Amino acid sequence: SLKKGPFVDGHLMTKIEKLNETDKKQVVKTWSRRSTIFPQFIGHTIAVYDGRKHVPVFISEDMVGHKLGEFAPTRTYKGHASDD
Amino acid sequence: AKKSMIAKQQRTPKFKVQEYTRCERCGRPHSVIRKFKLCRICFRELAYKGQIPGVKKASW
Amino acid sequence: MAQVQYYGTGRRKSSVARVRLVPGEGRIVVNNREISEHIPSAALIEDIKQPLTLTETAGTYDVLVNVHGGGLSGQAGAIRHGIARALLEADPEYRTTLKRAGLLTRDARMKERKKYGLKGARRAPQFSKR
Amino acid sequence: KGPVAKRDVLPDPIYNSKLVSRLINKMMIDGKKGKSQTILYKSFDIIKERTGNDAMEVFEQALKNIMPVLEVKARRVGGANYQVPVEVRPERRTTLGLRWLVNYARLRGEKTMEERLANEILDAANNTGAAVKKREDTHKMAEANKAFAHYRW
Amino acid sequence: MAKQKIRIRLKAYDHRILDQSAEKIVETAKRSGASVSGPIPLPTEKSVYTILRAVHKYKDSREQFEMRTHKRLIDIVNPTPQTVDALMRLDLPSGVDIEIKL
Amino acid sequence: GQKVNPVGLRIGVIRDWESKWYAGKDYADFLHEDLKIREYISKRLSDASVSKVEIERAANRVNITIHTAKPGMVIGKGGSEVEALRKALNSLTGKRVHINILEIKRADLDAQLVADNIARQLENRVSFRRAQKQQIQRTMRAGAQGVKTMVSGRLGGADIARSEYYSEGTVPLHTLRADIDYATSEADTTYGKLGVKVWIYRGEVLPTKK
RNA sequence: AAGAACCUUACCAGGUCUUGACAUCCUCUGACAAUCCUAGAGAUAGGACGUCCCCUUCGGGGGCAGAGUGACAGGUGGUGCAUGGUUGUCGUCAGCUCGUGUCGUGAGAUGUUGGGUUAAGUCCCGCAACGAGCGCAACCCUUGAUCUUAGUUGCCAGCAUUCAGUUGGGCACUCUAAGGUGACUGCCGGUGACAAACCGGAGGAAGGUGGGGAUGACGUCAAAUCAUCAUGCCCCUUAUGACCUGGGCUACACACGUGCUACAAUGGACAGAACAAAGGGCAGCGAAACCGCGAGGUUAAGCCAAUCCCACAAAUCUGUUCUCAGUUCGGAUCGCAGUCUGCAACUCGACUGCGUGAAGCUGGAAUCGCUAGUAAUCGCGGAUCAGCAUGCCGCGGUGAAUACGUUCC
């Protein structure tokens, strides 16, 4: 990125804000993987829309600046014939 | 789907970056020079038709 | 408006020069700089100065030349053809020995325009059967 | 077809002779007359420094010493190749001489290219070195097998 | 002694139209006027364009169509208002880039 | 090629562009309006016919002169038709208009007209060979130094494909002073479309000087 | 493919629509259109703030929306073994043909063969043939020499001015673009039928189709493109169509084609000095000044441009330094920290600073290009383009080796 600053679409902002202030709801899908993780966002688990299937993702304290959608690879491995 | 494409283009894009160039004479996108907004083939056929001066062809 | 002097334009491969054969010590002047200085060292500069030496030898006339365009060797060659044609305009009689010298004409040649499908205006990058 | 006209080289101011300009043509790499110029004058200087003698003389003797008298030419008229020895054209003589000269000079391995061109040209002066050895090898491939190229072809 | 002077400039793709326009635009300058500088040449800038021949592949074959752009200048020391009123009418040519400035 | 269009070569040295002007802040927009004018003249090509329209523009002005074998088709009775066309074009161009008219002598000599005519004959399902023969005879009546003509695509509906051509007199496209008119047309038979081409050698042009 | 982050994009997945995203006819009301809120990933739906305009004695005129309706619209759906159109290929190789006539039972042949000559079916001579058409050539453009016309924003020699052609002046010259001049074997000599033509020499800026480009003949390959456009036929239609979010077009054990960078002392690194051409620029180029090591930023003059800007030419030269090694060789890969563009740089952008320092010390079998300003190599610009050019198209710098010859491919 650059400066001022990391950019969530902003709906995730109010969502995680309301989820932080109250309710403590867990597991929620999102199509907007472009959004970066935030300190207020910590500890939540989001189903990430790779396209084929949502992949749930827990948020450790260590991850912030990495993109939220980065953790789930759309790519399928490998695929190769004769292993070993 | 060229009618759907030109309909997609003539309508205002949600973001200004989206507006790719395309000629009016033909609905083909891609490989369209921006300065004249013509097809390479559009400009080809018009070149044999002759639309602008001048010489034409392969000078210098 | 001073003492009479001959001059001869001389170009090569898009590099034009304007020589002036004012009589004097014979020290050469290129762009207000000595030929020993403007293109060090460079031995080829003596080849720029050869035509005057090949003709009777020697005056020697002072040269005030202004050149523009091309590279160093090209503009220097322009100095050469330029002093050559100026020497041609010196006296008509000299031209006879000059036919033996060649050393005129400026043969027009310059790098060819690139052909489409070719990198070197002649060279083709590659070919491969199958 | 027929023979083609060939341009004469602009003479080198030092040492006057055009043949040295032919060296300026052959030794040159990446189209740089100036690099050939510097290596040429430094070559004359290093020749001037060790074992005093005129550079033009040792050079002339060297070039006379590096020109083959005969050369083979392979031709597959049948099973296996058959080289045919023949008297060499003098232009081809100086060409092969200068080319094997610069080529073997390139591989001398000395830290200074000028000093190894010096060692090489003096080896040509002394009837030794890789160049004279190679001309001798061409002399061996020739004469010994000239019988097929006696007056047949 | 120097003073600002009107200096009309012409530009066109075709040249015959351009110098015919030059003759027409200086001819009005000659009548009811004075001095009248000639149409001095300008370097002219062409625009090359390489385009593929085939509808599909065969990129190795192409063609170069290009568009040159000529330019010219004309001057007159005497503003002479009558030929300026005469200047307002110009039947020819449809294809010309006249530009007036003082 | 195998055959580059002569029309792409004749222009400049021996012929003028169909539409000349200058640009300009908006080189594209003039071309857009002019191509649109071609789009509506093409609608006028449906029966009134036209060999060609010449176009000139000079800032808030236009000179879309027409030349046609049948001048009265576009004028109408009392000249009302050319006026209504003038309004129909004025409504579109957004600028002042005054469309002009011209009547070509010996109109069959023009390539565009004979090509459109033989194409209509192909629409009439007359034999293509006899039609090309009548073409050569008619252009022979027109009087010309040399004429060539060609047709392609399905011919009579026979076979998967066929192409034919007939000619008489010199037709030197490689000549740079030949002043050869070129034309193409596109017939629409139920069996399929028919390609149409014709070359007309009007004769060499001699340059003048004063 | 002259720019796949979204779009493009067609394909996948999910969420939505069925006279429709796009065009026309009908009836039919009504201006059309927008300002925000709410829910949603968007797509859109639910509300209010809002439109309610223009010419007509009342029928109307006009774009345009909405409603319904049959029609239709739509397909980058299939078919280049249905095509138009356009383009490769032998090949810029010199051939391919026709009219008339003759000959042959006929198919066919003659002309187009033969002699000389040419890059050429080029020319010449002869020939039962004489012509002609499409090509080659010529005609065009570009480059080079020179004249004339015309001298600013360009030009600076002769004069003064200044940091500066910058400013007086000059309008010579360079330079610029119009009209001319010039090359045609023509002049001489020799050969040849005294023909064509070749060779040699002179004249000449350029000599024997001057150099380069354009110019691609009949046709071959059912060659390529239904996907540029057009469209015969066939198929689909609350879906082979339309909208949207995200993906993918960039996969990864590997093979191949084609480029780039190197494997180094003719070199690397540092410092100083010096010579270009052409092209682009107003939704732009953006100087100068300033901030940051850098990338860039702040700010802003000038320029619709022979004025100003992009912009500094690089190799090279001159010295200093390393002294032959996986190296002060090369830069890979990756880490960290920044930066430009964009709603937005995870997939899948570019650039910079710092750090990390693969492989490679010239490459088997095999194979490619090029006869001179060509090969060799160094930088620059442009089309493309929000951003992204080792690709492509051009520009100039430096600038060779060899061509005995048609034995062989």
CA distance F208 to chain E (A): 14
8 Å CB contact between D141 and D72: yes
Cα-based angle F39, F40, F44 (whole degrees, multiple of 5): 120
Whole-Å CA distances, F70 to F47, F81, F102: 10, 14, 9
Nearest to C82 by CA among C93, C70, F187, A37: C70
Cα-based angle C77, C81, C87 (whole degrees, multiple of 5): 140
CB atoms E46 and B47 under 8 Å: no
Q: Does E60 touch chain C (CB under 8 A)?
A: yes
B24/G347 CA-to-C1' distance in Å? 35
CB atoms B54 and E65 under 8 Å: no
Residue B23 assigned as binding residue: yes
Whole-Å CA distances, B12 to B6, B18, F17: 11, 9, 36
F23/G100 CA-to-C1' distance in Å? 58
Chains E and A: 3 or more CB pairs within 8 Å of each other: no
Whole-Å CA distances, F164 to C97, F3, F144, F150, F171: 68, 15, 22, 6, 17
- Chain centroid to Cα F176, Å, comes to 21
CB atoms B49 and F7 under 8 Å: yes
In eight-state DSSP terms, residue C10 is: E
Scanning every strand, the nucleotide with its C1' closest to E7's CA turns out to be: G152
Q: Would you say the C-alpha torsion A47, A49, A50, A52 has a positive or negative sign?
A: positive
Q: Would you say the C-alpha torsion D88, D92, D98, D103 has a positive or negative sign?
A: negative
For chain E, what is the radius of gyration of the CA atoms?
19
CA distance E13 to chain B (A): 6
Spatial separation of the C-alpha atoms in residues F92 and F89, rounded to whole Å: 5
Closest E-chain CA to B47: E65
Helix H, strand E, coil C: the string for A41-69 is: HCCCEEEEECCCCEEEEECCCCCCCCECC
Window 1-20 of B, Cβ < 8 Å to E: none
How are the residues of chain C apportioned to helix, strand and coil, as percentages rounded to the nearest 5? Answer: 35, 20, 45
A45/G335 CA-to-C1' distance in Å? 29
CB atoms F61 and E94 under 8 Å: yes
Residue B31 assigned as binding residue: no
8 Å CB contact between D40 and D23: yes
Spatial separation of the C-alpha atoms in residues D91 and D93, rounded to whole Å: 5
Q: Which of F19, F22, F31 to mutate to test the interface with B (most CBs of B within 10 A)?
A: F31
**Phi, psi dihedral angles at F15 (to 5 degrees):** -140, 155
Method for this entry: cryo-EM
The three-class DSSP label of residue F199 is strand
Spatial separation of the C-alpha atoms in residues C30 and E47, rounded to whole Å: 36
Closest B-chain CA to F55: B51
- The CA dihedral of D87, D88, D89, D90, to the nearest 10 degrees, is -110
* Total CB pairs under 8 A between chain C and D: 12
Q: Does residue F46 have a cis peptide bond before it, meaning omega lies within 30 degrees of 0?
A: no
8 Å CB contact between C49 and C5: no
Task: Enumerate the residues of chain B whose CB falls inside 8 A of the CB of residue F18.
Answer: 49-51
Residue B26 assigned as binding residue: yes
**Phi, psi dihedral angles at F194 (to 5 degrees):** -120, 120
Name which of B41, B56, B60 is nearest E65 (Cβ-Cβ).
B56
CB atoms D14 and C43 under 8 Å: yes
CB atoms within 10 A of CB F4: 13
Task: Enumerate the residues of chain C whose CB falls inside 8 A of the CB of residue D10.
Answer: 47
Looking at the DSSP bridge assignments, the partners of residue C8 are C19
Q: Would you say the C-alpha torsion F186, F187, F188, F190 has a positive or negative sign?
A: negative
D83/G309 CA-to-C1' distance in Å? 68
Q: Specify the DSSP element, H or E, that contains C32.
A: none
Spatial separation of the C-alpha atoms in residues A70 and A66, rounded to whole Å: 7
Spatial separation of the C-alpha atoms in residues A51 and A29, rounded to whole Å: 12
Q: Does B37 touch chain F (CB under 8 A)?
A: yes
Looking at the DSSP bridge assignments, the partners of residue E9 are E73, E99
CA distance D26 to chain C (A): 17
Spatial separation of the C-alpha atoms in residues F54 and F62, rounded to whole Å: 10
Nearest to D51 by CA among D113, D122, D128, D101: D122
Spatial separation of the C-alpha atoms in residues F194 and F118, rounded to whole Å: 11
Burial of A71 (0-12, 13-18, 19+ CB in 10 A): middle
- The CA dihedral of C96, C97, C101, C102, to the nearest 10 degrees, is 0
Spatial separation of the C-alpha atoms in residues F56 and F191, rounded to whole Å: 41
CB atoms E95 and F61 under 8 Å: no
- The CA dihedral of E27, E28, E30, E35, to the nearest 10 degrees, is -110
CB atoms F21 and E95 under 8 Å: yes
Residues contacting F19, CB < 8 A, separation 6+: B51, F34, F54, F55, F56
Chains B and F: 3 or more CB pairs within 8 Å of each other: yes
Nucleotides of G under 7 A from a protein CB: 1-10, 12-13, 21-22, 40-43, 73-76, 82-91, 132-146, 149-153, 156-159, 168-169, 173-180, 202-207, 210-220, 222, 224-225, 227-233, 241-248, 251-253, 257-259, 265-267, 274-281, 304-306, 313-318, 323-324, 338-347, 367-377, 383-386, 392-408
CB atoms C42 and D37 under 8 Å: yes
